[PDB]
Symmetry: D2
Subunit: 249 residues, 4 copies
């Protein structure tokens, strides 16, 4: 097999390359994410969750990702630098994987998002008027700094900061939530990911996973794509969720 | 067919009975629900959502319920008194139903809940220490006035008041949320309804759907039951959710 | 001088008694608070914040209180058991004090509260309809589990749990906030403590500082009293607030 | 006297000018705010609250402002276009005024704010790391979209949208609150307006009342200024607050 090792910082990389060599895996090193990562049997990401999001932005078909967490919280990672070798051995030898859905947005045709699509004001400290439609029916209209359409994996990201619920990773859904809504009452809405979401706003920008962005005016449609994020199986993902969330800062 | 008409107040009853008589349905009137309601082909509830919850408290096997809303919000009802005949005719003639899961609780055998099981302090204005386990793993411990385990149908009830998300009726899940938690940070958790929930607390009471209560100490288990709530299909349930929620008060 | 030492647990008391004798202060020991505490030059509380609230419940005229924290967070305390001697000596030799307003409630004439007056449903898991008036004008009506009228000192107590803001101890105000409000929109209100607050509710109970309660129906009036809680000056009160708050749980 | 009439829209201006003429007031019309407005006895603003904020940005010494609300909620206005002549007459004849403090920030000397100073990320969807100091002590560090330092008048503006409390206009304080904080726990802080606020952030912009803005890096200080906003007395300001807030959208 051949693996790609993607690292934001140079630390721990020689060690990981050595461990992979013991597993009879050929290694190629990447200091930046690349679409060439599609040509590998699996990917080892060294960094936090953002490294993983930036890797995913290069992949349509996704080789399974193994994350070694040097960042902050590491909801998408599998191991720490202090003990990754055993978990990596398990992952390569069993080769069991999990798939989580990614969403596409009509404003950025070739871009996929694991966490969220956010619609924001082009100008900080100015609001936009956002209308939300789900399966063709207008369900809300609200003045806000922006509006988030997150997956369940994104429930612990931007949506969390905006006041959203923590949703377990195996419950497929969208979380629909405004950022700084100028209204007396508002609630996050949690809907089936099989539904079509439309967000309508003028003078806005759309951002996927905090990485890629574009101006738009009028309507954008957001729907589940055919190209999920693929990770090695983390048997502790549900258990670890609650502790990791409490450490978010 | 034979239908039971169950009413909180006697207003509108005679006209609903005459409407059923015109549909060639035999009618029996009930001023309070009873277990006898299982013997009918369908049930027409005249009242708000609480009337429906009280009807369900008496039903294991559930004949389809049609709700005529004389209450405040009416998330579980199908029509208003001003225009119910057309919708009632459609309901009886098509006889299409929807089933929503109910949960059971180990402290109260033979009691089912559509909205929530809530564990509260026995002493008002006094907190209880609550531990929460999901599929056998302790995921949180928190001091609070009480703790709610809600279905998605219950997301617009007690869980809503406690600060929970609005969840669409066709996404099956539990919402796990504290009432007045004494902690710097906390979040609602949304998990699969296939999971087993355990709530552990001393000096508490457990309440199903705001209707039935028992004192308990120690552990209670909450799980999906085999006996759902059955309603005639409301083709506008999803569309109506958003406007109805905004009117909550 | 003579000091009362009030303790919830038996443990650290002999140590505190010896420290006071070295400061030439006669000591009397109390396992429970009583009205006799008014007859002392000052009071040393050994416990958490609840022990201080229970002391205050017995005091109209309030000798200065010095708190030694054996409870959880201790916003009302001055020192810990591990190092209290130097702070106690400074407190007594300087005898500088701080006064924090307490409020009274028309339902319980001789009862005073430092944190809050709370109006709650007499029936567990059932809402009450609460109307709120400030300086004679009805400002809100809401269905809720209860309603809190807190001082700024109470902003880190029940009001905090209900979702209220943290208000610094030297900004005199009321925080008005519902517990589990069944409404799409609601906000905590912060008003001058010179204003008269009226809460109107049927089938309710009123509770002062989580300690003393009575059933009531109709209108209660809540206002600032002439008998503040008196503490030795804590020079680090403002500074310590933020760290202590982050530790609540 | 001489009055300036400032108008966002040109609709009711002729009506207002003729009314001032009846009160023997010399009128000068302004299509937009100018520092020349300082040279009038009073100012009549035709528009919503934003028009008033833009007028104030051009004023150090503030002639009393009378607001005619063509906007949406109009917390700073005194009358609607349908009935302004009676309230305007009372204002000119009694000439009773109210002063509300404005704040300055060190990044923009000579710029004053009535609602808030907000520190925001320069890039949408990108967080900044913000440290907050009050009277010289660091009281929080948080990753967020931005951070708001509001006056009590600003409690119904950006701070409101960010989840802050509603504070009555006659209780002077700062409300310190993050916008979309990436942390498990957070609270708004309400502190005395006598305190000095320092916000520290890199790659940020500071914005006064949603109008004037500048890039900054490092530290900014925010303090109460000597130049309040001056309005004609609105006898119903406290009473109207609660209804106006509930209509915010
Ligand atoms: N308040 C917030 N504003 C923007 N993004 C947020 C916020 N809170 C959580 N996030 C999450 O951050 C994710 C992007 O993570 P990322 O690691 O790229 O950003 P970062 O850690 O702040 O800094 P950098 O992009 O430079 O690594 C988004 O997908 C979003 O879900
Ligand atoms: N804050 C709250 N406290 C208790 N229950 C709540 C609250 N908010 C919403 N509810 C919902 O109310 C439901 C009970 O409905 P019910 O109609 O019996 O209550 P009610 O309308 O307040 O009382 P009643 O109908 O007997 O006059 C519960 O299942 C719960 O989901
Ligand atoms: N969720 C909550 N419910 C009730 N009280 C709360 C809550 N959160 C904070 N408090 C505060 O707790 C105060 C009472 O403190 P007290 O020490 O008596 O309670 P306790 O610590 O829970 O019980 P105890 O000390 O008897 O073991 C109240 O004045 C209130 O301000
Ligand atoms: N979510 C929000 N984002 C930014 N400002 C907000 C927000 N919610 C309320 N505000 C308030 O809006 C004020 C600015 O008012 P302003 O009238 O200029 O904005 P506007 O109503 O969006 O109109 P416009 O941007 O065209 O001038 C700020 O001082 C702030 O207090
Ligand atoms: Mg990052
Ligand atoms: Mg009811
Ligand atoms: Mg206690
Ligand atoms: Mg405006």
């Amino acid at each position: 097999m051949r693996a790609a090792v993607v690292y934001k910082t140079d630390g721990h990389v020689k060690r990981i390359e050595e461990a992979l060599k013991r597993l009879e895996v050929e290694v190629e090193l990447f200091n930046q994410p690349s679409e060439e990562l599609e040509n590998f049997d699996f990917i080892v990401s060294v960094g936090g969750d953002g490294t993983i999001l930036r890797i995913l932005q290069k992949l349509k078909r996704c080789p399974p990702i193994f994350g070694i967490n040097t960042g902050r919280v590491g909801l998408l990672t599998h191991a720490s630098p202090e003990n990754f070798e055993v978990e990596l051995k398990k992952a390569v030898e069993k080769f069991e994987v999990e798939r989580f859905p990614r969403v596409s947005c009509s404003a950025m045709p070739d871009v996929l998002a694991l966490n969220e699509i956010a619609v924001l004001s082009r100008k900080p400290a100015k609001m936009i008027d956002v209308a939300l439609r789900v399966d063709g029916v207008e369900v809300d209209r609200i003045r806000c700094d922006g509006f988030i359409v997150a997956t369940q994996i994104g429930s612990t990201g931007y949506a969390f900061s905006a006041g959203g619920p923590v949703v377990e990773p195996y419950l497929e859904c969208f979380i629909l939530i405004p950022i700084a809504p100028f209204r007396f009452g508002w609630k996050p809405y949690v809907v089936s990911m099989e539904r079509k979401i439309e967000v309508i706003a003028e003078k806005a920008i759309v951002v996927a996973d905090g990485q890629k962005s574009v101006d738009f005016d009028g309507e954008i449609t957001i729907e589940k794509s055919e190209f999920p994020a693929v990770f090695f199986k983390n048997e502790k993902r549900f258990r670890n969720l609650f502790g990791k969330v409490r450490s978010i800062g």
